Design a protein around this ligand. Structure first.
Ligand SMILES: COc1ccc(-c2oc3c(CCC(C)C)c(O)cc(O)c3c(=O)c2O[C@@H]2O[C@@H](C)[C@H](O)[C@@H](O)[C@H]2O)cc1
Ligand SMILES: [Mg+2]
Ligand SMILES: [Zn+2]
Length: 326
């Protein structure tokens, strides 16, 4: 049944953040049941003071979380509920352990958590923005569909569904503002927009010009933070990192098989199952081109986010070792 879920969740005792280990950057969701990931999510909203400050009724928050989880597809190897959940957990860790919570307003935090959980809702296993030839230093290409996505639209649909209105406690103006931030946060998770706007952020950081209170720069930082959390699987302790990387590869190969049948074209190497041997070199190219500079830059705003950079570095070394073939 579909309510046996709400029934169990609404009545369950929500363990502390410490007990749930959600404050750790090295957090793993693998050992948790779906119910436990929902409890972890309730704790995130609670410890960031969102339930209290925004007058969220318990049953409403529970129904919303379940609705979000239900709208992801378990048959998609990587971009599913566990990815969204991990993205939100990383956001929680960055806000708490990284001390980013005091740098932002409660409305921004509310928007970020909702965005983290909802950003990949319109994912059917079709990756429309990625890097081709990452293993080729001088020939890497960033590709993206000419058409756009409806991730925000799905997020809005759930937020406005009867019984799921976790934003009903906001004022008319607060509601409008918050929706704008959520939309921008979700759009920011598209690699295309990240690649497009990161230069400005890196330059500000390099020149010690980053100003939290400049609205334009605040927006830019929130977009960068979203990407940092979205890509955080790449920073986990090696064994966790590799398990997640296998999922990403599986999804990519499944896409290549599908586009082969639907478009009669051979997939780029990234989505070609027969090119598995090249994975380590591809992982290294991706980390160098997209991840390392972002995690380095984040440490300049939040020194305590160092674990993300540290993990990214360690994993690059291990992937590189494999590329050279141990
Ligand atoms: C385990 O943590 C990971 C995080 C991201 C990735 C990842 O790898 C990539 C690799 C490495 C080779 C592989 C066989 C994986 C490429 O060669 C080219 C890419 O564009 C990506 C990529 O976009 C990507 O990011 C993931 O997919 C992209 C599509 C998403 O936008 C992003 O959020 C994330 O989920 C892999 C592992
Ligand atoms: Mg995605
Ligand atoms: Zn994502």
């Amino acid at each position: 049944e579909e309510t046996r879920e709400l029934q169990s969740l609404a009545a369950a005792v929500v363990p502390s953040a410490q007990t749930l280990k959600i404050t750790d950057f090295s957090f793993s969701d693998f050992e948790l049941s779906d119910l436990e990931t929902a409890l972890c999510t309730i704790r995130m909203f609670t410890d960031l003071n969102l339930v209290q400050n925004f007058q969220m009724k318990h049953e409403v928050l529970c129904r919303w979380i379940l609705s979000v989880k239900k709208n992801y597809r378990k048959n998609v190897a990587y971009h599913n509920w566990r990815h969204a959940f991990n993205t939100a957990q990383c956001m929680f860790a960055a806000l708490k352990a990284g001390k980013i919570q005091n740098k932002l307003t409660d409305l921004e935090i509310l928007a970020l958590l909702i965005a983290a959980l909802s950003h990949d809702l319109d994912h059917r296993g079709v990756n429309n923005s990625y890097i081709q030839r990452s293993e080729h230093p001088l020939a890497q290409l960033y590709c993206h569909s000419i058409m756009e996505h409806h991730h925000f639209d799905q997020c809005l649909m759930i937020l406005n569904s009867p019984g799921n209105q976790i934003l009903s406690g906001l004022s008319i103006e607060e509601y409008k503002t918050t929706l704008k931030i959520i939309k921008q946060a979700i759009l920011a998770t598209d690699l295309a927009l990240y690649i497009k706007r990161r230069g400005e952020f890196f330059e500000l950081i390099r020149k010690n010009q980053f100003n939290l209170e400049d609205p334009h720069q605040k927006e830019l930082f929130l977009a960068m933070l979203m990407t940092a959390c979205d890509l955080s699987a790449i920073t986990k302790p090696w064994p966790i990192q590799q398990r997640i990387a296998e999922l990403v590869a599986t999804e990519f190969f499944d896409q290549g098989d599908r586009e082969r049948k639907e478009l009669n074209i051979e997939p780029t190497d990234l989505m070609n199952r027969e090119k598995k041997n090249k994975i380590p070199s591809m992982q290294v190219g991706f980390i160098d081109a997209i991840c390392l500079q972002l995690y380095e830059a984040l440490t300049h705003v939040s020194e305590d986010c160092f674990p993300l950079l540290d993990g990214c570095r360690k994993n690059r070394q291990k992937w590189q070792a494999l590329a050279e073939q141990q």
